[PDB]
Symmetry: C3
Subunit: 116 residues, 3 copies
């Protein structure tokens, strides 16, 4: 059984450093919020990056925390004009029997505005 | 076990309203075609939107029908010149033991041209 | 249980033919490297294409080798300036109990530079 976990975080500036730190923070909190003990529980992780972020290497953030063996993919987030700027989103596919209503989705910084 | 479900639908005009209605129609038919009784069966849902659609909020369509707890992600569809215009595509990851050849994929409106 | 499989391959020229052949080669090797006997084992396959590739139809390559019933999705890879050019990436979601450290990820041609 698989459960997707969503995450989102914003960065104040378009720099690789800011993007790296933000991605790392989000990944760690998504793991913490769901009590995930090992990366072996993750089937894969998909990232989306908004068009206002340039040198975005979210994969390197995952690598720094040891997710070397977790398959990662990064795609351009649909560029809706006027949408929340500078956002890194995550969709982690988690092998778990955790009920859908018990999965914890994480929205940080300005990304909290994304959820009602 | 997980089975992906594909869906595709076109819109006649580039407006949030047209995109919303089309997305909703597609999602409902994909669920209906596969006899899905609860959203809890969905691991996650990924959407792709073509570059000729601007204010596309497919996630709001999913929310309107109650998919609040289903993790969603939306990415830009590879923009191949001359390809079918104004398409909203869906890839639903379904937790099921349904045989691959028994999963029903849904193509609506002009999107029927996508499949041979 | 699901395990993602990553693949990446580069093409020397931006033509549909070059993209088709490369995609096919990558898909076949990813299957071969993991001893996959049937496509029925694949939940879905997601492709990302870099912005320097134009008429990219990776789905047709999958179709040619018989993956008609495997749900496919293709999105634009985040366009980081100066990143490795002309890359077709794959993320295959595999229903298997294979340990995460035993899954074989495939990087071909210039894509070998992507992994340390």
């Amino acid at each position: 059984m698989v459960r997707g976990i969503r995450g989102a975080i914003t960065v104040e500036e378009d720099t690789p450093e800011a993007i790296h730190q933000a991605t790392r923070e989000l990944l760690l909190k998504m793991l913490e919020a769901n009590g995930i003990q090992s990366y072996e529980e993750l089937a894969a992780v998909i990232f989306t990056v908004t068009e206002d972020l340039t040198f975005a290497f979210p994969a390197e953030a995952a690598r720094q925390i040891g997710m070397h063996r977790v398959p990662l993919l990064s795609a351009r987030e649909v560029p809706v004009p006027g949408s929340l700027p500078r956002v890194i989103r995550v969709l982690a596919l988690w092998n778990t029997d955790t009920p859908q209503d018990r999965v914890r989705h994480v929205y940080l910084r300005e990304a909290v505005r994304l959820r009602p």
